[PDB]
Design a protein around this ligand. Structure first.
Ligand code: NI
Ligand code: NI
Ligand code: NI
Ligand code: NI
Length: 57
DNA sequence: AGAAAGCCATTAGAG
DNA sequence: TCTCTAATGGCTTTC
């Protein structure tokens, strides 16, 4: 099973990542609810995004 | 302590 | 057949 994230979900997450590369638990809960994703998906998106951030300085 | 969260390598599924 | 990235597993680190 693999969900494709919409333009809107990816853009909202990228905009969040612009300010904070790590999330507080309280903020993770808000983003999950606003985007209709689980907290675990939000957690994994930021982990993947940080790993991609490392490979690009 | 031990649960939550992170980091890495890796997979695999959508398009 | 490609690329991209969602998603996993096994550790390590944080708190
Ligand atoms: Ni700015
Ligand atoms: Ni321990
Ligand atoms: Ni923790
Ligand atoms: Ni494949």
């Amino acid at each position: 099973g693999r969900q494709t994230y919409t333009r809107y979900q990816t853009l909202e997450l990228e905009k969040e990542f612009h300010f904070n590369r790590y999330l507080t638990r309280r903020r993770r809960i808000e983003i999950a609810h606003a985007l209709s994703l689980t907290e675990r998906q939000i957690k994994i998106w930021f982990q993947n995004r940080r790993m991609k951030w490392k490979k690009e300085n």
